[PDB]
Tab-separated table of all heavy atoms in Angstrom:
chain	number	residue	atom	x	y	z
A	1	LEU	N	98.496	75.426	27.149
A	1	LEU	CA	99.244	74.570	28.107
A	1	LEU	C	100.042	75.421	29.102
A	1	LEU	O	100.162	75.037	30.248
A	1	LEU	CB	100.283	73.745	27.352
A	1	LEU	CG	99.695	72.576	26.538
A	1	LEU	CD1	100.814	71.918	25.726
A	1	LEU	CD2	99.038	71.617	27.489
A	2	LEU	N	100.531	76.621	28.758
A	2	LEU	CA	101.270	77.412	29.757
A	2	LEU	C	100.304	78.001	30.788
A	2	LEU	O	100.633	78.046	32.022
A	2	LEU	CB	102.021	78.552	29.039
A	2	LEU	CG	103.104	78.099	28.082
A	2	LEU	CD1	103.687	79.262	27.321
A	2	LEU	CD2	104.227	77.350	28.837
A	3	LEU	N	99.080	78.409	30.366
A	3	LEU	CA	98.123	78.893	31.359
A	3	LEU	C	97.680	77.765	32.281
A	3	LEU	O	97.446	77.977	33.515
A	3	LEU	CB	96.936	79.526	30.620
A	3	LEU	CG	97.296	80.803	29.885
A	3	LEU	CD1	96.385	81.063	28.665
A	3	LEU	CD2	97.285	81.969	30.843
A	4	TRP	N	97.562	76.543	31.752
A	4	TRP	CA	97.231	75.426	32.584
A	4	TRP	C	98.311	75.135	33.569
A	4	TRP	O	98.032	74.652	34.694
A	4	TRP	CB	96.859	74.234	31.687
A	4	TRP	CG	96.080	73.149	32.419
A	4	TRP	CD1	96.567	72.077	33.022
A	4	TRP	CD2	94.648	73.124	32.614
A	4	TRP	NE1	95.497	71.378	33.644
A	4	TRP	CE2	94.351	71.973	33.372
A	4	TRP	CE3	93.653	74.038	32.199
A	4	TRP	CZ2	93.054	71.675	33.725
A	4	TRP	CZ3	92.334	73.651	32.504
A	4	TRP	CH2	92.076	72.503	33.299
A	5	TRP	N	99.574	75.315	33.156
A	5	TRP	CA	100.662	75.132	34.074
A	5	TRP	C	100.485	76.036	35.336
A	5	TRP	O	100.664	75.563	36.432
A	5	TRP	CB	102.020	75.362	33.422
A	5	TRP	CG	103.158	75.010	34.342
A	5	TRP	CD1	103.782	73.794	34.481
A	5	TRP	CD2	103.748	75.880	35.284
A	5	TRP	NE1	104.681	73.847	35.516
A	5	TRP	CE2	104.660	75.094	36.045
A	5	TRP	CE3	103.503	77.226	35.678
A	5	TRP	CZ2	105.392	75.611	37.113
A	5	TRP	CZ3	104.194	77.703	36.799
A	5	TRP	CH2	105.125	76.933	37.440
A	6	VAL	N	100.229	77.317	35.084
A	6	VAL	CA	100.064	78.249	36.195
A	6	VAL	C	98.882	77.876	37.054
A	6	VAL	O	98.961	77.994	38.314
A	6	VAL	CB	99.921	79.728	35.738
A	6	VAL	CG1	99.993	80.658	36.903
A	6	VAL	CG2	100.990	80.091	34.765
A	7	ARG	N	97.825	77.335	36.484
A	7	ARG	CA	96.694	76.909	37.276
A	7	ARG	C	97.049	75.759	38.231
A	7	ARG	O	96.672	75.759	39.381
A	7	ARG	CB	95.569	76.473	36.309
A	7	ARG	CG	94.504	75.579	36.994
A	7	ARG	CD	93.590	75.099	35.886
A	7	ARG	NE	92.434	74.335	36.318
A	7	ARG	CZ	91.370	74.871	36.884
A	7	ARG	NH1	91.324	76.183	37.175
A	7	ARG	NH2	90.336	74.113	37.140
A	8	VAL	N	97.766	74.753	37.702
A	8	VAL	CA	98.147	73.627	38.460
A	8	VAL	C	99.062	73.944	39.647
A	8	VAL	O	98.779	73.552	40.788
A	8	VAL	CB	98.907	72.569	37.606
A	8	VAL	CG1	99.581	71.519	38.443
A	8	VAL	CG2	97.988	71.864	36.566
A	9	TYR	N	99.988	74.887	39.388
A	9	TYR	CA	100.896	75.381	40.413
A	9	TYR	C	100.125	76.085	41.539
A	9	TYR	O	100.238	75.708	42.706
A	9	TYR	CB	101.884	76.319	39.801
A	9	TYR	CG	102.798	77.010	40.802
A	9	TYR	CD1	103.941	76.380	41.226
A	9	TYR	CD2	102.474	78.264	41.303
A	9	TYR	CE1	104.865	77.018	42.111
A	9	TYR	CE2	103.326	78.906	42.153
A	9	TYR	CZ	104.503	78.237	42.548
A	9	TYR	OH	105.364	78.870	43.456
A	10	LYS	N	99.280	77.008	41.152
A	10	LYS	CA	98.521	77.809	42.161
A	10	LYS	C	97.524	76.939	42.910
A	10	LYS	O	97.303	77.165	44.079
A	10	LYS	CB	97.763	78.963	41.537
A	10	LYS	CG	98.628	80.112	40.922
A	10	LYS	CD	98.383	81.363	41.747
A	10	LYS	CE	98.732	82.699	41.057
A	10	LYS	NZ	100.145	83.177	41.321
A	11	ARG	N	96.909	75.997	42.246
A	11	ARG	CA	95.916	75.150	42.962
A	11	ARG	C	96.585	74.410	44.038
A	11	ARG	O	96.021	74.191	45.068
A	11	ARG	CB	95.148	74.223	42.007
A	11	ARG	CG	94.024	74.765	41.187
A	11	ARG	CD	93.103	75.740	41.916
A	11	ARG	NE	93.427	77.130	41.959
A	11	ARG	CZ	93.336	77.852	43.059
A	11	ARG	NH1	92.896	77.294	44.219
A	11	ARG	NH2	93.627	79.118	43.040
A	12	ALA	N	97.769	73.790	43.704
A	12	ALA	CA	98.476	73.011	44.755
A	12	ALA	C	99.001	73.905	45.849
A	12	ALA	O	99.063	73.516	46.966
A	12	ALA	CB	99.566	72.187	44.196
A	13	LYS	N	99.433	75.102	45.534
A	13	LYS	CA	100.087	75.965	46.503
A	13	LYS	C	99.073	76.677	47.428
A	13	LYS	O	99.404	76.924	48.570
A	13	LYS	CB	100.919	77.004	45.779
A	13	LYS	CG	101.529	78.101	46.588
A	13	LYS	CD	102.943	78.377	46.127
A	13	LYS	CE	103.668	79.288	47.062
A	13	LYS	NZ	105.132	79.078	46.976
A	14	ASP	N	97.888	76.987	46.974
A	14	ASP	CA	96.891	77.626	47.834
A	14	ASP	C	96.341	76.693	48.878
A	14	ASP	O	95.833	77.185	49.906
A	14	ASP	CB	95.701	78.133	47.008
A	14	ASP	CG	96.074	79.318	46.102
A	14	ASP	OD1	97.055	80.041	46.460
A	14	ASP	OD2	95.472	79.491	45.038
A	15	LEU	N	96.441	75.375	48.733
A	15	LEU	CA	96.020	74.426	49.758
A	15	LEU	C	97.168	74.097	50.660
A	15	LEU	O	96.964	73.331	51.602
A	15	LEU	CB	95.558	73.108	49.094
A	15	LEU	CG	94.139	73.031	48.539
A	15	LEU	CD1	93.952	71.693	47.758
A	15	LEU	CD2	93.058	73.212	49.558
A	16	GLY	N	98.366	74.634	50.454
A	16	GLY	CA	99.486	74.473	51.351
A	16	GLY	C	100.341	73.214	51.102
A	16	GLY	O	100.979	72.697	52.001
A	17	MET	N	100.377	72.695	49.860
A	17	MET	CA	101.051	71.455	49.547
A	17	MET	C	102.330	71.749	48.784
A	17	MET	O	102.524	72.874	48.237
A	17	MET	CB	100.167	70.563	48.739
A	17	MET	CG	98.864	70.281	49.399
A	17	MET	SD	97.588	69.650	48.255
A	17	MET	CE	97.522	67.948	48.760
A	18	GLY	N	103.174	70.734	48.674
A	18	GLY	CA	104.374	70.934	47.890
A	18	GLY	C	104.009	70.980	46.441
A	18	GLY	O	102.990	70.396	45.975
A	19	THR	N	104.832	71.667	45.663
A	19	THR	CA	104.472	71.840	44.238
A	19	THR	C	105.137	70.780	43.378
A	19	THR	O	105.798	71.154	42.366
A	19	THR	CB	104.763	73.265	43.831
A	19	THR	OG1	105.999	73.661	44.372
A	19	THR	CG2	103.698	74.211	44.374
A	20	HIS	N	105.035	69.525	43.701
A	20	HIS	CA	105.780	68.501	42.923
A	20	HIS	C	105.111	68.179	41.607
A	20	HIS	O	105.730	67.629	40.763
A	20	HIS	CB	105.977	67.178	43.667
A	20	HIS	CG	106.626	67.351	44.986
A	20	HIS	ND1	106.047	67.980	46.050
A	20	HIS	CD2	107.803	66.757	45.431
A	20	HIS	CE1	106.863	67.893	47.073
A	20	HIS	NE2	107.918	67.181	46.748
A	21	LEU	N	103.802	68.439	41.481
A	21	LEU	CA	103.070	68.083	40.341
A	21	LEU	C	103.372	69.109	39.193
A	21	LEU	O	103.240	68.784	38.052
A	21	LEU	CB	101.596	67.990	40.715
A	21	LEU	CG	100.610	67.465	39.662
A	21	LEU	CD1	100.684	65.983	39.526
A	21	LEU	CD2	99.175	67.854	40.029
A	22	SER	N	103.799	70.310	39.514
A	22	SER	CA	104.162	71.311	38.574
A	22	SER	C	105.521	71.039	37.909
A	22	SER	O	105.744	71.470	36.763
A	22	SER	CB	104.242	72.617	39.216
A	22	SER	OG	103.022	72.939	39.773
A	23	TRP	N	106.441	70.359	38.601
A	23	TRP	CA	107.746	70.074	38.059
A	23	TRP	C	107.682	69.026	36.893
A	23	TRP	O	108.247	69.217	35.796
A	23	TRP	CB	108.666	69.634	39.183
A	23	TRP	CG	108.610	70.501	40.376
A	23	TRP	CD1	108.228	71.830	40.436
A	23	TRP	CD2	109.026	70.190	41.713
A	23	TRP	NE1	108.334	72.326	41.702
A	23	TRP	CE2	108.811	71.333	42.548
A	23	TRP	CE3	109.565	69.022	42.354
A	23	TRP	CZ2	109.048	71.359	43.896
A	23	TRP	CZ3	109.842	69.042	43.706
A	23	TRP	CH2	109.621	70.202	44.471
A	24	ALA	N	106.891	67.970	37.158
A	24	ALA	CA	106.676	66.937	36.165
A	24	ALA	C	105.893	67.514	35.009
A	24	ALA	O	106.200	67.175	33.783
A	24	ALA	CB	106.007	65.856	36.840
A	25	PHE	N	104.843	68.351	35.246
A	25	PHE	CA	104.124	68.987	34.161
A	25	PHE	C	105.033	69.845	33.303
A	25	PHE	O	104.856	69.941	32.063
A	25	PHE	CB	102.919	69.689	34.688
A	25	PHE	CG	101.926	70.106	33.690
A	25	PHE	CD1	101.785	69.365	32.447
A	25	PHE	CD2	101.135	71.215	33.866
A	25	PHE	CE1	100.868	69.736	31.480
A	25	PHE	CE2	100.164	71.566	32.907
A	25	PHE	CZ	100.072	70.827	31.710
A	26	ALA	N	105.954	70.557	33.969
A	26	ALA	CA	106.850	71.350	33.216
A	26	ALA	C	107.746	70.513	32.285
A	26	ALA	O	108.019	70.943	31.113
A	26	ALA	CB	107.673	72.197	34.185
A	27	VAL	N	108.136	69.352	32.682
A	27	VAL	CA	108.931	68.471	31.834
A	27	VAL	C	108.164	68.051	30.594
A	27	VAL	O	108.639	67.994	29.455
A	27	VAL	CB	109.493	67.291	32.626
A	27	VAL	CG1	110.164	66.193	31.766
A	27	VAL	CG2	110.451	67.802	33.682
A	28	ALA	N	106.866	67.681	30.840
A	28	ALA	CA	106.060	67.279	29.687
A	28	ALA	C	105.811	68.408	28.687
A	28	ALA	O	105.812	68.206	27.443
A	28	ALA	CB	104.731	66.773	30.261
A	29	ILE	N	105.584	69.646	29.210
A	29	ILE	CA	105.376	70.777	28.282
A	29	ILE	C	106.662	71.032	27.510
A	29	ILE	O	106.602	71.413	26.341
A	29	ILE	CB	104.928	71.994	29.119
A	29	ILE	CG1	103.532	71.862	29.694
A	29	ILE	CG2	104.951	73.281	28.283
A	29	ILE	CD1	103.151	72.942	30.568
A	30	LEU	N	107.774	70.850	28.146
A	30	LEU	CA	109.032	71.059	27.427
A	30	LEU	C	109.184	70.056	26.286
A	30	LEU	O	109.725	70.418	25.227
A	30	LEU	CB	110.179	71.007	28.459
A	30	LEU	CG	111.559	71.253	27.818
A	30	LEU	CD1	111.655	72.602	27.054
A	30	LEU	CD2	112.622	71.186	28.902
A	31	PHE	N	108.815	68.805	26.459
A	31	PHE	CA	108.857	67.852	25.349
A	31	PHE	C	107.898	68.230	24.243
A	31	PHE	O	108.311	68.168	23.074
A	31	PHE	CB	108.542	66.455	25.819
A	31	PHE	CG	108.731	65.416	24.748
A	31	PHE	CD1	109.808	65.514	23.854
A	31	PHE	CD2	107.849	64.376	24.597
A	31	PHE	CE1	109.966	64.580	22.832
A	31	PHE	CE2	107.997	63.427	23.563
A	31	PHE	CZ	109.033	63.547	22.706
A	32	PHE	N	106.677	68.663	24.547
A	32	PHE	CA	105.750	69.157	23.560
A	32	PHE	C	106.352	70.336	22.748
A	32	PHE	O	106.232	70.421	21.554
A	32	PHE	CB	104.421	69.530	24.182
A	32	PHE	CG	103.549	70.406	23.306
A	32	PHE	CD1	102.726	69.849	22.353
A	32	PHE	CD2	103.555	71.807	23.400
A	32	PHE	CE1	101.883	70.613	21.539
A	32	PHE	CE2	102.716	72.574	22.602
A	32	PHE	CZ	101.901	71.992	21.684
A	33	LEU	N	107.082	71.276	23.455
A	33	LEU	CA	107.616	72.437	22.759
A	33	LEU	C	108.863	72.064	21.947
A	33	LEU	O	109.205	72.727	20.982
A	33	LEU	CB	107.963	73.499	23.701
A	33	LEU	CG	106.853	74.402	24.270
A	33	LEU	CD1	107.356	75.174	25.441
A	33	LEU	CD2	106.336	75.337	23.204
A	34	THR	N	109.614	71.046	22.380
A	34	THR	CA	110.820	70.704	21.703
A	34	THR	C	110.474	70.145	20.287
A	34	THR	O	111.025	70.651	19.288
A	34	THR	CB	111.627	69.596	22.407
A	34	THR	OG1	112.035	70.116	23.675
A	34	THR	CG2	112.776	69.071	21.606
A	35	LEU	N	109.606	69.123	20.211
A	35	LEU	CA	109.234	68.617	18.935
A	35	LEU	C	108.030	69.390	18.448
A	35	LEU	O	106.977	69.174	19.007
A	35	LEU	CB	109.002	67.123	19.000
A	35	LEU	CG	107.724	66.354	19.210
A	35	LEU	CD1	108.153	64.938	18.870
A	35	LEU	CD2	107.322	66.337	20.679
A	36	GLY	N	108.218	70.320	17.492
A	36	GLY	CA	107.149	71.283	17.348
A	36	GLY	C	107.503	72.733	17.273
A	36	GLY	O	107.053	73.444	16.343
A	37	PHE	N	108.330	73.252	18.181
A	37	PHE	CA	108.794	74.657	18.068
A	37	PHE	C	110.304	74.796	18.136
A	37	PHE	O	110.839	75.448	17.234
A	37	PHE	CB	108.088	75.505	19.180
A	37	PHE	CG	108.590	76.932	19.210
A	37	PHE	CD1	108.117	77.836	18.242
A	37	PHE	CD2	109.586	77.342	20.080
A	37	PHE	CE1	108.595	79.157	18.236
A	37	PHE	CE2	110.099	78.620	20.030
A	37	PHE	CZ	109.609	79.572	19.077
A	38	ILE	N	110.984	74.217	19.094
A	38	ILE	CA	112.400	74.413	19.262
A	38	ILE	C	113.255	73.720	18.164
A	38	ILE	O	114.144	74.372	17.545
A	38	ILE	CB	112.921	74.005	20.662
A	38	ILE	CG1	112.095	74.744	21.693
A	38	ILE	CG2	114.385	74.277	20.794
A	38	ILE	CD1	112.474	74.311	23.111
A	39	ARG	N	112.947	72.472	17.855
A	39	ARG	CA	113.636	71.806	16.831
A	39	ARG	C	113.415	72.385	15.454
A	39	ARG	O	114.310	72.472	14.652
A	39	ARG	CB	113.399	70.307	16.877
A	39	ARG	CG	114.342	69.495	16.028
A	39	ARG	CD	113.821	68.114	15.693
A	39	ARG	NE	114.713	67.514	14.748
A	39	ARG	CZ	114.407	67.390	13.473
A	39	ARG	NH1	113.160	67.777	13.029
A	39	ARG	NH2	115.286	66.854	12.625
A	40	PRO	N	112.107	72.700	15.081
A	40	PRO	CA	111.860	73.325	13.812
A	40	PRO	C	112.567	74.667	13.640
A	40	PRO	O	113.056	74.958	12.538
A	40	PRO	CB	110.371	73.590	13.793
A	40	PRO	CG	109.846	72.416	14.553
A	40	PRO	CD	110.859	72.232	15.692
A	41	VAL	N	112.664	75.481	14.738
A	41	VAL	CA	113.406	76.714	14.636
A	41	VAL	C	114.897	76.487	14.484
A	41	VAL	O	115.545	77.152	13.700
A	41	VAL	CB	113.083	77.627	15.831
A	41	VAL	CG1	114.100	78.727	15.973
A	41	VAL	CG2	111.731	78.215	15.733
């Protein structure tokens, strides 16, 4: 999922567009990591 994040960011930025789709994706990744890694630790 973190490598996919970088892909989504670069794909939108190489075409000259705003990177709004990476912000929302970051939020979703954070929820996956919270339940699963951060809370168990």
Side-chain angles (χ1 to χ4, degrees):
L1 288 173
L2 297 173
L3 292 154
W4 199 267
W5 187 91
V6 190
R7 161 189 187 74
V8 165
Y9 176 88
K10 289 246 200 269
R11 281 315 87 223
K13 171 139 192 155
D14 291 332
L15 280 172
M17 304 163 106
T19 43
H20 303 66
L21 187 78
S22 302
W23 311 338
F25 193 26
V27 171
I29 291 174
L30 182 55
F31 187 36
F32 163 84
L33 281 166
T34 294
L35 94 169
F37 175 78
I38 303 177
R39 192 200 173 253
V41 165

